[PDB]
Amino acid sequence: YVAALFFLIPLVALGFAAANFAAVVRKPEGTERMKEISSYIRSGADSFLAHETKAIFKVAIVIAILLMIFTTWQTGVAFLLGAVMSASAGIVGMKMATRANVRVAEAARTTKKIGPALKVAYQGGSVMGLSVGGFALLGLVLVYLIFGKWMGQVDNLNIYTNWLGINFVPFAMTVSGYALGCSIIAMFDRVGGGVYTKAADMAADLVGKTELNLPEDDPRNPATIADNVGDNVGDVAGLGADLLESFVGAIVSSIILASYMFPIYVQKIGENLVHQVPKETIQALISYPIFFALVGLGCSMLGILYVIVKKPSDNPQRELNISLWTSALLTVVLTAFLTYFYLKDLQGLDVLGFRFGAISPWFSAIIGIFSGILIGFWAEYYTSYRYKPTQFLGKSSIEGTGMVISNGLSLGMKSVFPPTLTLVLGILFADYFAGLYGVAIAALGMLSFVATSVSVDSYGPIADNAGGISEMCELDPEVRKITDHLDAVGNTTAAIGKGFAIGSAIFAALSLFASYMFSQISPSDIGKPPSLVLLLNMLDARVIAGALLGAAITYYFSGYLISAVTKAAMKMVDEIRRQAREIPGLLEGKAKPDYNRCIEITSDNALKQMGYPAFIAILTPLVTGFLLGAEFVGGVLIGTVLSGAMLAILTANSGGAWDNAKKYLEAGNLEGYGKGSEPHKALVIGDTVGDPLKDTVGPSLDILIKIMSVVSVIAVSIFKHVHLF
Amino acid sequence: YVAALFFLIPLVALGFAAANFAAVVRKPEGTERMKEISSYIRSGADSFLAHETKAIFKVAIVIAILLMIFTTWQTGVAFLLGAVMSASAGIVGMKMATRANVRVAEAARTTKKIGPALKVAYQGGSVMGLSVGGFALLGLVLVYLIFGKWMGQVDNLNIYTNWLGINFVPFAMTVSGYALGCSIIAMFDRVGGGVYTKAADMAADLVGKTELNLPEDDPRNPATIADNVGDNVGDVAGLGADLLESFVGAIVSSIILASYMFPIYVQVHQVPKETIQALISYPIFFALVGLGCSMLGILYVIVKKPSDNPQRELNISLWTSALLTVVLTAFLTYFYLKLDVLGFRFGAISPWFSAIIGIFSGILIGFWAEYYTSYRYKPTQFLGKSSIEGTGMVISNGLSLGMKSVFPPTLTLVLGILFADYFAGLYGVAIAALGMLSFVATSVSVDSYGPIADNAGGISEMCELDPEVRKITDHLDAVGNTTAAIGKGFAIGSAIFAALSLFASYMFSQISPSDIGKPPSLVLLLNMLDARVIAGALLGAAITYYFSGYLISAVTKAAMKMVDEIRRQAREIPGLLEGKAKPDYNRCIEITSDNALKQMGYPAFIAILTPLVTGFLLGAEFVGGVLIGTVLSGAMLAILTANSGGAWDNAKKYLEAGNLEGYGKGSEPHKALVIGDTVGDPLKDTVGPSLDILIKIMSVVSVIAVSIFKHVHLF
């Protein structure tokens, strides 16, 4: 029927991405030096991503075997499917960007205008965004059809108990495994690529600009190629992995709640269970988020096509915002129709959530979108150098490096507010509209047009690489100005994407707190009213202690990521100093440096440090539970949500502001002081201090939130009574 | 009987502090240049503290009148009493330090050893700590005797409702007003002094060391005198205010919970009135025993043979005070309390155990502080080493060190909460919150010891003395920074415990006389799955972060103003850098004073209003969520900022001791460490301390005012 037409949308999106790749590759590349630089960066990125993928997939096979042992095999199969999906999205994005960077560079060089370069960069971004959306929805639909339909886990959806004494719902456990695989692979990719790129960027920027007195991404700098390999590895593949994980997480949270609703909402009447809701309603609610995501992917495809066929403009932010708005409006309308018709007459919504009938979920979704948009706007206010905060930061740059650091930290901590209030209002409204199911539907709708968001976000790194390639090949300063404008727009878009991701994570984390309080129910007491089930008393000393511990664990995770970055940062700083002083004629320009040193340093550090964060995110719930019950784990989840949201928003805004103020000063817009002045060095120090907090901690925080919440939701059935205290 | 002997302890502490002040003043000060510099610094500190005190006391009178209007007059009277108590403790500490700085400096200069300077600095610190403890306990005992005994508010312990629809217990409301006044005055003092001193320090350090290439606190630097006046204003008066506020807040939380326990635990009252009265009076006797043990430890450490390692002497003081407190409080709990229905599961000794936790917790925190802040350990030394790689490296490694150190103390607090709960419910949780500050006198002493050493070093460097004097001052100042970090940890831990206890008291206060029968098991219930509660938690975390950011910005404004002023002076006054001209310290003094006085008001009003607005907007669950998020985020940020600022400052000092191989005071690593120290100053001396004050003030205001918007909410 129409379900098949909907389920074929992800394949159309993947085909569109492949077509965009074929079109960009058919574009003309640059000169011979441009080809050589692109080859260097592409080879580095390919090698590091190959090593990362091998390691991550070994770990993924191990985790899949464990999941198969301790739960149903369907869980392990879904885990592997999600791992493959996220890894493939990341690899596709990286393999597309490694080729589109030089294309954008050559376009901006020949045409001397922003239109063509913007168009090619948006083509690459669309490749990655369509790949992400299509992979996520394809994995989800394959799971829903094989383990939900072919095997019929969506038909029984009952509370079984496995051999290890674990209470589980079949389709619930399968989607949990799928989301866990997605999020764990995304965690590995993000941590690795972030460590790599941020160490390289810190070392190169700091040493070169502040000490050696070189231009940004100068060929004499033995770390520039490492920096660009990181831009392609950590800022692309990791970005796609994280965003696909967020999309799949919102959708799987909605689906898990819908599935768990059926066997719990029952009435015990003389030892006879009477289901308060018909199975058809739960099945409609389960299939609803998938159709929602498919309609959203279609609307994103429409907007991306309109923006890639439209006449190019000189203001790239205008084009990106036009794409986002068109996708969002198409999604709103088509999803209104989908919610009205699909949920027409179900007869069981009143019992759970929806108070305004079939349209109740749609409203929630709307909230999400709007919420996201709001955050987006706020991002552009705090990150863009065309507004008050970033400009005041750039001005304060005249007073000293310490002034820059303090003002950046204050700007981040202040910007923490408006988006948090947006999320508060969104939570309240989605609740009022359709309970926790609508909370999850809003989490999803905030990313309903995830394809366009991922596209507009990945657009940036391509422009950054184009600028790096133009600087390495000594191009016309007009090319550098085009790349700098595109890169500022890309920083704004990356801040917007981080905000979107963190908001979706918070919404899905509330929905998952609900599902986690649900999973604790055993078949023995499968009759108590959900009003008593969904209860996590905060006055229980265990819960508040767990909240404290979760906040501390989030902060320690961020600190460990920062330290893992700074280790390689210092190593490469020292290596660059050594090369500058021990290689004859390197600074004069008559000698070639050794980029391989920094490449290998960053690769080794990233490969060594990428493992611990994922394992922490996987184990923390299990250990905390087996030590102090399930209320402590609930408190830990609460504290994790709070601290992670706060730190992620703060770091995203602060890093965006710092980088855009550095770029604004580099454009000479700072009266009197140029690109080589002491204020520029202070802004460079600020940008290096913002780099690791913007490209590592922030993104990884939401992945940690979702991974930990999913692990707890899956494993609470055990430590609920197998605790030590 | 023996109760009068107990009620006389705070007066003895105040007398001991006055005697220590008279003894330090009887010591010989330095030369004419030292006398002139000390007089200038004392005049500046006195002037700024006078203005700050006048403004804060006008605001305090206004707030007391408002409290009298909307609640009982006893609340306003106790508010004024606590305001006066905290302001007096701070002013006494500051007036003692402004005179003890030059005395410590001259002692360390003449003796050429660390012993005499350490002894005099600890004398000043003991003056301030005894002042704080004595004033806090005297105000609290006067309230307990006048409104608790003379008027007998501890006799009825009923749930009344005032004309504005507020449910309250008489003595509960009175102690709430006292603690609220204490915390609001501490908030004003802390915010003002922190802005002042941190702006001055940022300006001076950055401009002088990074640009003009001058030594720390050089007379040519027109901000060194302003920086030291700030050290005396914000790091002394504010410190005493904050610590007295935490002490009184723990005790008042204990008292409020004890009072509210009676009329709620009914089936017929589940607990006899005598038991509730004994539990109400118990925290006061506990605090008195703790003050006595702190006095004993301070006396032993000021009479004990001086050592060359001052941290050893300070740790010996802390250990002796803590052990004396543990033993004497064990005896007090055994005899005075010579329960099962509420909390205590091990009989009369149940509360004492909890207190122990607190103490030990504090002690534990102490070690962790000394592990992360002292340059004699791995983290601070690694930071100093990373200083060779660049300023950005210093900043990133400092942030990482703070965020990691955030953990061990958090786990300590988690275990303490869990164990105190297991032992004696929320009453024992609050008693542990208090016991962590049981020896608050010794803690305040060891903490105020630091700023005195900082001022002595600044004065010795201003007069160009013997480098041995500067080395003595640097060692003492590093020890003082470590002790200040330990004190901040003490405050934040006590704040977390008391904030949980106040969450309990706030869930209790919502009970109205109409439904004064529901089982307490159902009353103490704040479901976290309520969308409103989680939204409020998110909003509270965001509000804490914005509070911190606004404080940082208030600091950076005056910091930039003074940086520009110093550059202008350097370029337009002939011979200033050459040394043939005299700078204008009054300019920086006035800049920082004006900025601090202007920015000093808003944070306290935010902390006071946020609960009221959030409540009248979204019921009581939203306010509960806001309190939870605020507590969590504030604890995290306070621990992080304290540890990070300590690490940065001690790494700078570790590089100053030459322990960094090859690089001296003028090398790029020293400039990077100075940039790190300037970035840490505002996060260490302004945000961190204000966070726990905000937590306590907001939770107390909520506990008092929830009775209105609990059902008079807009949604």
Ligand SMILES: NC1=[SH]c2cc(CNC(=O)c3cc4ccccc4[nH]3)ccc2N1
């Ligand atoms: N129009 C309608 S009535 C209706 C009823 C149900 C199932 N049980 C109930 O609501 C139910 C209400 C209630 C109140 C007190 C005690 C026990 C109770 N049990 C589900 C859908 C539906 N739709």
Ligand SMILES: NC1=[SH]c2cc(CNC(=O)c3cc4ccccc4[nH]3)ccc2N1
């Ligand atoms: N419209 C209506 S109210 C109503 C009430 C009753 C009798 N008690 C119940 O059903 C009932 C038991 C139970 C246990 C847990 C959660 C919810 C529950 N509900 C039966 C039918 C009916 N139909």
Ligand SMILES: [K+]
């Ligand atoms: K970027």
Ligand SMILES: [K+]
């Ligand atoms: K200090």
Ligand SMILES: [Mg+2]
């Ligand atoms: Mg850079």
Ligand SMILES: [Mg+2]
């Ligand atoms: Mg880059």
Ligand SMILES: [Mg+2]
């Ligand atoms: Mg670049």
Ligand SMILES: [Mg+2]
């Ligand atoms: Mg950038």
Ligand SMILES: [Mg+2]
């Ligand atoms: Mg950068």
Ligand SMILES: [Mg+2]
């Ligand atoms: Mg300083």
Ligand SMILES: [Mg+2]
């Ligand atoms: Mg000082």
Ligand SMILES: [Mg+2]
């Ligand atoms: Mg000083």
Ligand SMILES: [Mg+2]
């Ligand atoms: Mg100091």
Ligand SMILES: [Mg+2]
């Ligand atoms: Mg300082």
Ligand code: NA
């Ligand atoms: Na995410």
Ligand code: NA
């Ligand atoms: Na405090």
